[model samples]
Target: VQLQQPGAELVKPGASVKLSCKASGYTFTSNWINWVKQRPGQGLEWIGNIYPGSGYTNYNERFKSKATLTVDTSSSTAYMQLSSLTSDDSAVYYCARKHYFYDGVVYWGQGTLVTVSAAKTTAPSVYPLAPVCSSVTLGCLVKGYFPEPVTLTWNSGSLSSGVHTFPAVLQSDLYTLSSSVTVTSSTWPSQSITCNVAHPASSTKVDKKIEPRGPT
Candidate 1:
């Protein structure tokens, strides 16, 4: 069975987190679903296991009071809520399906990294830096900015031939998106090179242009 889990998350202490696992391609309740945790520099711990068919569950004595396992048959998803979390509870959590009469699980989902640290957000930034020119070719540079996957493009109506743009890259914690491009520099001086940035989290776009530092 394929389990759908949440992506990385950032939360503060004393907060509750509901880790999700949506199952598909098999009977949702055929086997018991287990919630496991692997803390930094630690082995896996079977925090709890739940039977979706009957809403019955069993948890490790250590987590019996802090973890609550629940399921929603209508959505075919299993959830484990971690309450009153602290730094010690920060770990990569996974949902797994038990093997028949076995002591371990047979199927597991991708690990979800949960960080229980001070909450904060870094504002996004966009800068259309100067482009590189080498007699005939140009290597455009669009450097540094946040919450990644920013769209990048260059106004090419003025360029001649031989043009290519590279994929965006994230620097430092994936909070910044940076990219570049290569094209014919013969279109410089008169033609403008514009870098356009757009993301789902923000509506305002960074549609800025960069001119050649000097004659190409």
Candidate 2:
């Protein structure tokens, strides 16, 4: 979830106020957080960008208007607060930017949130693929899962018992050691195959899966 304007700041002008913009989903610090503000009749302005990894903030002097942005990597969130809330402080706040996998191809994020007070926006990442299920020599071709070892498991009984020593053709060396495998199966529809990924220090889970919808 990517969120800005963390909690509700219920105060009138001249009050010391603050709100947190927290982040959940993917590595917390990899994707930076940006704060944007809008007043009643005014358009949104870029307040600043914060690198959660380093607690670095670049604020816009023009937007020093009672707003502060901060990040908590330990809690995996960002924050935005308005001190001395006034009619101007009553405007909406939003967060932006999404991160791609090592492939650096696809990125997704929830749209900016508009609020009379404050709110959080949730964005989900999806792995997209179209597989041509056939009885020939090829069955599945999984691609671009890096740093963590990924495998396609089916039925847990046949094909691949569990793992394989496969060589990957990925171009990234920063994550764990991304690895993918292709498997051939006679039964395609009734069976299920999952890309089980293992991330150190984090939960090793499935990033995504496919139910299969006939190939083009």
Candidate 3:
């Protein structure tokens, strides 16, 4: 079995994002399609799976309410819709063919990284509202008003798997994204925070940065 999933998407929090998985190379409706999520560097978590031929489903308790599964037999594709997203929900998602007679996900599609962040705008801002790194337990705050999705990094490293990233919030006609990153005592003296906002409407990434200035 072969599966095709969407490349990537940056969606605003509280908004919905749908992913498609097209199956081929075998009887399309004969097997089950499963969805899994992997936070940046974490292990996979089952997000609920479906059987397209009969419109039957078996969902995990952890994702029963957070995900919606559907299929289109005519096109041989399955879809997953995630709603009311938060920073806690951002991750790379994958779809696979659950072997009907086997005990594993035999065929898999490449993961799609979904970033839930504020959309990119004309200018993005990072405010280091602190004098001492440790004193500001919440770390520095970055703000940008845009409705698209973007990725956050620290000192050239992508945010780790378990780091907390604040979700995008709606503000009038646009969306506002605010996230904070903590600096370790050793790296506080040299660390810088940055965000790479990606969207089709912008020619380049809406990059924003905050240089280190606080006492380590």
Q: Which candidate gets the maximum lDDT versus the true structure?
A: 1
Answer with 2 or 3, whichever has the higher lDDT: 3
Question: For model 2, what is the error of residue 32's alpha carbon versus the real structure, in angstroms, after optimal superposition?
Answer: 1.4
Query: With candidate 1 superimposed using the best TM-score fit, by how many Å does residue 100's alpha carbon deviate from the native?
Result: 7.9
TM-score of candidate 2 relative to the true fold: 0.43
Error of 2 at 141 (Å): 56
User: Candidate 3: worst 10 consecutive residues by lDDT?
Assistant: 131-140
* RMSD for each of the candidates: 7.8, 15.6, 8.9
Report the lDDT tens digits of candidate 3 across residue range 50-117: 88889899999988768999999999989999988988888889998866677754889987777687
Worst 10 residues of 2 by lDDT: 117-126
Lowest-scoring 10 consecutive residues by lDDT in candidate 1?
A: 140-149
Candidate 3's TM-score reads 0.55
Prediction 2 global C-alpha lDDT: 0.49
Return the lDDT, model 1, position 84: 90
The sequence of per-residue lDDT tens digits that candidate 2 reaches over residues 1-216 is 345333223343455555555555767787667767765457868878788788877889976756677877778877666665554556556676566355454332332222222222212122434355434121234344332223434333344542343444434322222223354456444555544433221234444444575644
Model 3 off-target regions past 4 Å? Answer: 99-105, 121-216
lDDT of 1 at 150: 44
Off by over 4 Å in 2: 4-8, 101-216
